[PDB]
Each structure stands twice: as structure tokens, then as C-alpha cells.
Amino acid sequence: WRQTWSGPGTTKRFPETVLARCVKYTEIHPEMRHVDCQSVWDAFKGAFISKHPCDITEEDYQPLMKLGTQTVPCNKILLWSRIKDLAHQFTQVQRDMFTLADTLLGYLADDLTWCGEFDTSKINYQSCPDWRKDCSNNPVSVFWKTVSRRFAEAACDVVHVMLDGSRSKIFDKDSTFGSVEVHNLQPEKVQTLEAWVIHGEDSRDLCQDPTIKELESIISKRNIQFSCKNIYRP
Numbered sequence: 119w120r121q122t123w124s125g126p127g128t129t130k131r132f133p134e135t136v137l138a139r140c141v142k143y144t145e146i147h148p149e150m151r152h153v154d155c156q157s158v159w160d161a162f163k164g165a166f167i168s169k170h171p172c173d174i175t176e177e178d179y180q181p182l183m184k185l186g187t188q189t190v191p192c193n194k195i196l197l198w199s200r201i202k203d204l205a206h207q208f209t210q211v212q213r214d215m216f217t218l219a220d221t222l223l224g225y226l227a228d229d230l231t232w233c234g235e236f237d238t239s240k241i242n243y244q245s246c247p248d249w250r251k252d253c254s255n256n257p258v259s260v261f262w263k264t265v266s267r268r269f270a271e272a273a274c275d276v277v278h279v280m281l282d283g284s285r286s287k288i289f290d291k292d293s294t295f296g297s298v299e300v301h302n303l304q305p306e307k308v309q310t311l312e313a314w315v316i317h318g319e320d321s322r323d324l325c326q327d328p329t330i331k332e333l334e335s336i337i338s339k340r341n342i343q344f345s346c347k348n349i350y351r352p
């Protein structure tokens with residue numbers, strides 16, 4: 119039996135959008151011709167269709183992760199927390215830096231919402247679970263959790279993270295960066311995490327904020343060097 123959820127339903131034209139994005143991505147990036155976009159869509163579907171949308175596991179997304187596997191320039195990863203648009207905008211100018219949005223899976227899934235239901239093979243366009251009001255293990259949250267774990271595992275040498283100085287918690291231990299990514303930067307592989315605290319709020323040294331000291335101690339226990347910089351948005 120189905121229930122009404124508290125969050126928006128699946129983005130209109132979801133199947134066509136994912137397929138069209140996959141076709142566009144594989145055209146631009148020749149390294150990915152070995153991917154059949156029909157196969158990618160099948161695997162995507164099998165992660166959440168005919169499943170209760172609060173019982174989704176990272177394991178459900180493994181077939182899609184396997185088809186969407188992609189080498190990346192591991193020494194040029196730019197992570198970010200709660201500052202997506204500015205991050206992307208930074209990498210359009212500093213072109214040699216690489217974010218999750220530049221990967222196939224991140225490009226396919228950007229700004230979309232999706233879920234299914236236990237009793238049917240249909241996409242639910244009516245509503246989907248809100249992460250706070252309904253459940254954390256919903257199709258969208260678990261997707262981003264899964265790809266993020268894997269993206270952090272891929273990084274090497276010097277990893278950069280853009281953080282937003284205008285947030286109450288500049289570093290939030292409970293965000294995706296703060297839980298999943300920070301704890302999966304691999305001790306040997308990654309030598310340094312360099313944080314960039316962005317101003318646009320208080321205009322003084324924000325690298326001494328309690329939450330940045332938290333971030334420093336977390337990183338430090340994984341045998342990774344930590345650096346911080348105050349940077350000003352134009």
C-alpha cells in the first residue's frame with residue numbers, strides 16, 4: 119500500500135532527461151563510449167523502482183556505480199559543502215579543477231528528484247520522501263551518499279574543499295561532506311586537505327571558527343595535513 123509523502127514528487131520527464139544527459143555526456147567525453155545509455159538507465163531504474171522509498175540502500179545503487187565508473191584526475195578534486203553553484207562557477211574559470219558535477223553520474227543526477235513505490239513498477243510523480251520529515255534512506259539521499267563515498271575514495275594528493283562563510287556551521291559535521299566524504303579520504307592516498315572559507319557575514323579570520331577547528335582535528339586523525347584559507351567572493 120502506498121502513502122503520500124511530504125516532499126516533491128519525481129521531476130517531470132525524468133527518464134528522458136537522464137537518457138538525454140547520458141547521451142550528451144558520452145558525446146562530449148570520448149573516454150566514455152563504452153557506456154550504453156540504455157544500460158545506464160536500466161541500472162538507475164533498478165536501484166529504486168518497485169522498492170519502498172525509505173528502504174533504499176547504497177547496495178541498491180551498486181549496479182549503477184559499476185556502469186558509471188570513471189577514472190578521474192584524482193589530484194585536482196574540488197569538494198564543497200552547501201555552496202554548489204559558486205563551486206561550479208570557480209571551476210569554469212579555473213578549468214583544471216574537477217568536481218562531482220563533472221562526472222557522468224553527478225551530471226546525470228543534478229537537481230533532479232526521483233522515487234518509486236513498493237507495489238508498482240511506476241515512477242512516483244506525486245510525491246517523494248522528505249529527508250527530515252519522512253526518512254533519510256530515500257532514493258535521492260542514498261544516491262548522493264553512495265557516489266560521494268566513492269568520489270572521496272578516488273581523491274589523492276592535495277584535495278580542496280570550498281565552504282560557505284555565511285552559514286551558521288561553516289563546517290557541518292552532519293552534512294554529506296562532513297560525514298561521508300571527510301571520513302573516506304584515504305590516509306595514504308591523500309596528503310593534504312585545503313579548505314577555502316568563502317566570504318560574500320563577519321569579515322575576519324574564519325579559519326579559527328570552532329567548526330573549522332573541528333574539521334582540522336577530524337582530518338588530522340586520518341594522518342592528513344590540513345590547510346585553511348580565507349577567500350573573498352566577487
Ligand SMILES: *[C@H]1O[C@H](COP(=O)(O)OP(=O)(O)OC[C@H]2O[C@@H](n3cnc4c(N)ncnc43)[C@H](O)[C@@H]2O)[C@@H](O)[C@@H]1F
Nearest residue numbers: 197198199200218219228229258259262266293294295
Ligand atoms: C559530495 O558532497 C559535497 C556536497 O556536500 P554538502 O555538505 O553540500 O551536502 P549536504 O548539505 O548534506 O546536502 C546533501 C544533498 O545535496 C544534494 N546534492 C548534492 N550534490 C548535488 C548536485 N551536484 N546536484 C544536485 N543536488 C546535489 C542532494 O539532494 C543531497 O541529498 C560535494 O562537494 C561532494 F561531491
